[PDB]
Design a protein around this ligand. Sequence first.
Ligand code: HEM
Ligand code: HEM
Ligand SMILES: C[C@H](CCC(=O)O)[C@H]1CC[C@H]2[C@@H]3[C@H](O)C[C@@H]4C[C@H](O)CC[C@]4(C)[C@H]3C[C@H](O)[C@]12C
Ligand SMILES: C[C@H](CCC(=O)O)[C@H]1CC[C@H]2[C@@H]3[C@H](O)C[C@@H]4C[C@H](O)CC[C@]4(C)[C@H]3C[C@H](O)[C@]12C
Ligand SMILES: C[C@H](CCC(=O)O)[C@H]1CC[C@H]2[C@@H]3[C@H](O)C[C@@H]4C[C@H](O)CC[C@]4(C)[C@H]3C[C@H](O)[C@]12C
Ligand SMILES: C[C@H](CCC(=O)O)[C@H]1CC[C@H]2[C@@H]3[C@H](O)C[C@@H]4C[C@H](O)CC[C@]4(C)[C@H]3C[C@H](O)[C@]12C
Ligand code: FES
Ligand code: FES
Lengths: 359, 359
Amino acid sequence: RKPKTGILMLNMGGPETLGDVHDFLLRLFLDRDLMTLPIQNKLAPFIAKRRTPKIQEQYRRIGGGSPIKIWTSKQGEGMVKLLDELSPNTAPHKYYIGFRYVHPLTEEAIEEMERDGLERAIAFTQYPQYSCSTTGSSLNAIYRYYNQVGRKPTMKWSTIDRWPTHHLLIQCFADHILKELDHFPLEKRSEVVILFSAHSLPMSVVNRGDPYPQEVSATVQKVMERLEYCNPYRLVWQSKVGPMPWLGPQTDESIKGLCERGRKNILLVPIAFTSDHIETLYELDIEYSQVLAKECGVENIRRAESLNGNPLFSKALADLVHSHIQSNELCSKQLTLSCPLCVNPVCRETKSFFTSQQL
Amino acid sequence: RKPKTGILMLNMGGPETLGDVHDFLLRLFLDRDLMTLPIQNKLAPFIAKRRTPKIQEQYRRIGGGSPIKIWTSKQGEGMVKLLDELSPNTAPHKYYIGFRYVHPLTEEAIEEMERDGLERAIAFTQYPQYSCSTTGSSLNAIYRYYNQVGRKPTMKWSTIDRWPTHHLLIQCFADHILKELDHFPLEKRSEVVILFSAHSLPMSVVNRGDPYPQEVSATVQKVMERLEYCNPYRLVWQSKVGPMPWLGPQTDESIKGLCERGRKNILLVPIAFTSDHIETLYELDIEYSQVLAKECGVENIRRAESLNGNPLFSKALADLVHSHIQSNELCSKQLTLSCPLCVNPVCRETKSFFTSQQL
Ligand code: HEM
Ligand code: HEM
Ligand SMILES: C[C@H](CCC(=O)O)[C@H]1CC[C@H]2[C@@H]3[C@H](O)C[C@@H]4C[C@H](O)CC[C@]4(C)[C@H]3C[C@H](O)[C@]12C
Ligand SMILES: C[C@H](CCC(=O)O)[C@H]1CC[C@H]2[C@@H]3[C@H](O)C[C@@H]4C[C@H](O)CC[C@]4(C)[C@H]3C[C@H](O)[C@]12C
Ligand SMILES: C[C@H](CCC(=O)O)[C@H]1CC[C@H]2[C@@H]3[C@H](O)C[C@@H]4C[C@H](O)CC[C@]4(C)[C@H]3C[C@H](O)[C@]12C
Ligand SMILES: C[C@H](CCC(=O)O)[C@H]1CC[C@H]2[C@@H]3[C@H](O)C[C@@H]4C[C@H](O)CC[C@]4(C)[C@H]3C[C@H](O)[C@]12C
Ligand code: FES
Ligand code: FES
């Protein structure tokens, strides 16, 4: 059969090889849903060119690019196999990858879904916790697509716009933490600090009402509850860019501080981005990790595995899509409230786009 | 019988009448566990003297003082009566009030407990979510008292140092939200924004690793889960004092922004302090509330009733202490980990005090 139900898997994407870095950065610095700059169209190319070498080097340090496309396909394949059996009524299901900044682009994916003549189309964010900078931008792209092409959808749209506490998602994290705890010496396991490390946001964005920090905090609590509070934890924030204030404590400064304070065993947990991504200073820079161990005698810094290809993760994705279908919901209740200090007029347009959809 | 088990209920306290404001402020500005000032012993009295009139005026706007002692007593009474039934092996139970900044002071309470010759003493924070500034300060006072008087406890100590997701607590919040929602016109009820408002922290304290924002966020998610996400929400942060950066969005600014963006019905929820306390600008200031209703036509701003009161709240407190007793725990796993950037040497001492206790 032709596909009946399209599942658009939304994420920012990542450069597949170091050659893909420039254009990735270009599209990112051009995203007005992410950031607004003066003379943006002139400034984005310059910033992209300027930061390309730094970012290529970071991707090189993690194997030569981002594996997001391959992992997202794997998960999409596994999700679709389960849905076809879970929801025969909406079968056949087809997943589509819609990346914000690399091919296949959100717009290229919408264009294919439309030509496929689907009956139903689900904007399924791959960020469990909603930020306007992440899911918001991806959702805004869907609206901006139809508005640029000056026409209306031929498919029935809905969105799964957040899922920070999904039970199978929580189960996956708790499982990966336990597996990584096993790699610490038995005599030290109970002493390990679990540092949940999510990507930071600028304080300007936190202060305008972005939902992300509170949702990330919920995921953390649910994971520790599942783990029966077996170890001590903190939620800290990684990878802040530039000189402006961002939400802290910063992951790097917290690893250093913890080691200076006698905590020699640290387990980093990627709580807010489900694929392998760029690592932190103490994980990557050997000059820095050398100094740390000399001064404070750090014993073990380890990072839990990314949800990547874990099949209980595909079960999570299918469970979410299946529940969404059964519920007949068009979006979360949370999507219907914009940030108290939102200054982007596209946000409410995108909201109405979803809440107003046929069905 | 003579009392067997003491439950020291810890909170900052509040001035019972307007004449109690100066000494309340004095002890607050003197608290090195709360804030660090140069020449603190000299500066605190001056600050306390200078801010007394403004804080008196704020307490006048809410009826002439804080009801915290009366509410804490009532809950203490209810708690104990349930505990005598719940845990006959530790009966009779006796509650003690230990306020940080007003009588009865933490130290006065410790002294009475020792005189009563209790077998067991439980340091039971009345802040559900842990901050170094609140629970941390109250706990450091317990260690600082024995270190001051140069001797050791004659009672077996433990602590219930946080409880941000206790099921009965969550049930109380959800009940009080529903009750308050009933006061909005039924045609408008589903549109009302639930604005959870917790007291803010300075960014310097957030950035050093304070556990509070993540724990408050957890309370919020558990409440919204129980409410089945019936209304849209944001967690915002109130009462920020002075010029320095504090964690936002700020409650006042978010109320203004929401109304300017078409949200005319708002329900404020005191999610992190369980007694009546000083209210916000749009609740207290007639000039401001008028400007707002005129410029963007705000229709209803209501505040959910404070918990300290409700018998399911007493039932929550007793359930906590009973579970604590059954568990044999000396403190949470979380207390065993200090802030990654803690610069207060007393924090580790206090931690050791509890984890090292006999039994
Ligand atoms: C307003 C908020 C944000 C801004 C301004 C921002 C900024 C940036 C910038 C400039 C880059 C390119 C690398 C560089 O030039 O240094 C980047 C990459 C990235 N960002 Fe963000 N970001 C934001 C929010 C987020 C959130 C909320 C997440 C995760 C859920 C996230 C995840 C990523 C990832 C995965 C990369 C790719 C490189 C890596 O693996 O770290 N970002 N971001
Ligand atoms: C380092 C963090 C904190 C600082 C520096 C701070 C500062 C202050 C100061 C100076 C006052 C006296 C009133 C004034 O002079 O304006 C005050 C009162 C108060 N604070 Fe905090 N505070 C902090 C954290 C917290 C937290 C986490 C909570 C709640 C859990 C809280 C709840 C209160 C309450 C209830 C009052 C009494 C007056 C009122 O009802 O607002 N504070 N605080
Ligand atoms: C002033 C502005 C702040 C953004 C805003 O208006 O809100 C900032 C944001 C990004 C900045 C630019 C980027 O950091 C890239 C350049 C970096 C150089 O150090 C200065 C010029 C440079 C071209 C910057 C000029 C200026 O400080 C910019 C344009
Ligand atoms: C980190 C990068 C620096 C570019 C460079 O100097 O090479 C700059 C370029 C554009 C900047 C952003 C834009 O100035 C818009 C935002 C302005 C806010 O004051 C801080 C976050 C904010 C989202 C900025 C964060 C950061 O400083 C960015 C992302
Ligand atoms: C010197 C020190 C700066 C270093 C620090 O951040 O601790 C700061 C922290 C608290 C400050 C004081 C407090 O802010 C209270 C006072 C407020 C007055 O309006 C200015 C001076 C005032 C008397 C301040 C002087 C000085 O800047 C102090 C003493
Ligand atoms: C409350 C009062 C603000 C007076 C005012 O309304 O301007 C002042 C006096 C002591 C101050 C505190 C002290 O300066 C110590 C802390 C220093 C940090 O850099 C900011 C928060 C910090 C905790 C301060 C916040 C705020 O400026 C305080 C709390
Ligand atoms: S920026 Fe959050 S809704 Fe627009
Ligand atoms: S300041 Fe948090 S542990 Fe000392």
